[PDB]
Amino acid sequence: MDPNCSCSTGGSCTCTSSCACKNCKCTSCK
Ligand SMILES: [Cd+2]
Ligand SMILES: [Cd+2]
Ligand SMILES: [Cd+2]
């Protein structure tokens, strides 16, 4: 059902020096 994050759906989300989610599937997260 995806229970880990809520970032949105379109082209780009950012994720740089500090994150406010649990782990995520993005660039340095997994
Ligand atoms: Cd996230
Ligand atoms: Cd993200
Ligand atoms: Cd993240």
mmCIF file with all atom_site columns, C-alpha atoms and ligand atoms in Angstrom:
data_model
loop_
_atom_site.group_PDB
_atom_site.id
_atom_site.type_symbol
_atom_site.label_atom_id
_atom_site.label_alt_id
_atom_site.label_comp_id
_atom_site.label_asym_id
_atom_site.label_entity_id
_atom_site.label_seq_id
_atom_site.pdbx_PDB_ins_code
_atom_site.Cartn_x
_atom_site.Cartn_y
_atom_site.Cartn_z
_atom_site.occupancy
_atom_site.B_iso_or_equiv
_atom_site.pdbx_formal_charge
_atom_site.auth_seq_id
_atom_site.auth_comp_id
_atom_site.auth_asym_id
_atom_site.auth_atom_id
_atom_site.pdbx_PDB_model_num
ATOM   1  C  CA . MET A 1 1  ? 0.000  0.000  0.000   1.00 0.00 ? 1  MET A CA 1
ATOM   2  C  CA . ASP A 1 2  ? 3.433  2.580  0.147   1.00 0.00 ? 2  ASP A CA 1
ATOM   3  C  CA . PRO A 1 3  ? 3.218  3.380  4.337   1.00 0.00 ? 3  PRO A CA 1
ATOM   4  C  CA . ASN A 1 4  ? 7.185  4.984  4.239   1.00 0.00 ? 4  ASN A CA 1
ATOM   5  C  CA . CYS A 1 5  ? 6.411  8.802  2.500   1.00 0.00 ? 5  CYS A CA 1
ATOM   6  C  CA . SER A 1 6  ? 3.816  11.796 0.997   1.00 0.00 ? 6  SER A CA 1
ATOM   7  C  CA . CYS A 1 7  ? 6.523  14.034 -1.491  1.00 0.00 ? 7  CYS A CA 1
ATOM   8  C  CA . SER A 1 8  ? 3.397  14.586 -4.510  1.00 0.00 ? 8  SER A CA 1
ATOM   9  C  CA . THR A 1 9  ? 3.484  12.719 -8.465  1.00 0.00 ? 9  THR A CA 1
ATOM   10 C  CA . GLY A 1 10 ? 4.634  15.259 -11.702 1.00 0.00 ? 10 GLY A CA 1
ATOM   11 C  CA . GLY A 1 11 ? 8.572  15.978 -12.932 1.00 0.00 ? 11 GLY A CA 1
ATOM   12 C  CA . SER A 1 12 ? 10.948 17.132 -9.653  1.00 0.00 ? 12 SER A CA 1
ATOM   13 C  CA . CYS A 1 13 ? 10.543 16.945 -5.412  1.00 0.00 ? 13 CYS A CA 1
ATOM   14 C  CA . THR A 1 14 ? 14.425 18.502 -4.320  1.00 0.00 ? 14 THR A CA 1
ATOM   15 C  CA . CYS A 1 15 ? 15.672 16.076 -0.926  1.00 0.00 ? 15 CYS A CA 1
ATOM   16 C  CA . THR A 1 16 ? 19.355 18.153 -0.240  1.00 0.00 ? 16 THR A CA 1
ATOM   17 C  CA . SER A 1 17 ? 21.322 18.763 3.547   1.00 0.00 ? 17 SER A CA 1
ATOM   18 C  CA . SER A 1 18 ? 18.024 17.676 6.007   1.00 0.00 ? 18 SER A CA 1
ATOM   19 C  CA . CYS A 1 19 ? 14.585 15.310 5.154   1.00 0.00 ? 19 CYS A CA 1
ATOM   20 C  CA . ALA A 1 20 ? 10.910 15.567 7.249   1.00 0.00 ? 20 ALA A CA 1
ATOM   21 C  CA . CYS A 1 21 ? 9.475  11.786 6.042   1.00 0.00 ? 21 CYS A CA 1
ATOM   22 C  CA . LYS A 1 22 ? 10.836 7.945  7.522   1.00 0.00 ? 22 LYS A CA 1
ATOM   23 C  CA . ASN A 1 23 ? 13.541 6.442  4.566   1.00 0.00 ? 23 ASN A CA 1
ATOM   24 C  CA . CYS A 1 24 ? 11.996 7.362  0.600   1.00 0.00 ? 24 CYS A CA 1
ATOM   25 C  CA . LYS A 1 25 ? 12.895 5.693  -3.215  1.00 0.00 ? 25 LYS A CA 1
ATOM   26 C  CA . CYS A 1 26 ? 14.697 9.347  -4.536  1.00 0.00 ? 26 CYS A CA 1
ATOM   27 C  CA . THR A 1 27 ? 18.901 10.266 -5.173  1.00 0.00 ? 27 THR A CA 1
ATOM   28 C  CA . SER A 1 28 ? 21.252 9.733  -1.622  1.00 0.00 ? 28 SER A CA 1
ATOM   29 C  CA . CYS A 1 29 ? 17.728 8.266  0.393   1.00 0.00 ? 29 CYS A CA 1
ATOM   30 C  CA . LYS A 1 30 ? 17.760 4.518  -1.726  1.00 0.00 ? 30 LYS A CA 1
HETATM 31 CD CD . CD  B 2 .  ? 9.717  11.489 0.875   1.00 0.00 ? 1  CD  B CD 1
HETATM 32 CD CD . CD  B 2 .  ? 11.666 13.108 -2.197  1.00 0.00 ? 2  CD  B CD 1
HETATM 33 CD CD . CD  B 2 .  ? 13.791 12.030 1.059   1.00 0.00 ? 3  CD  B CD 1
#
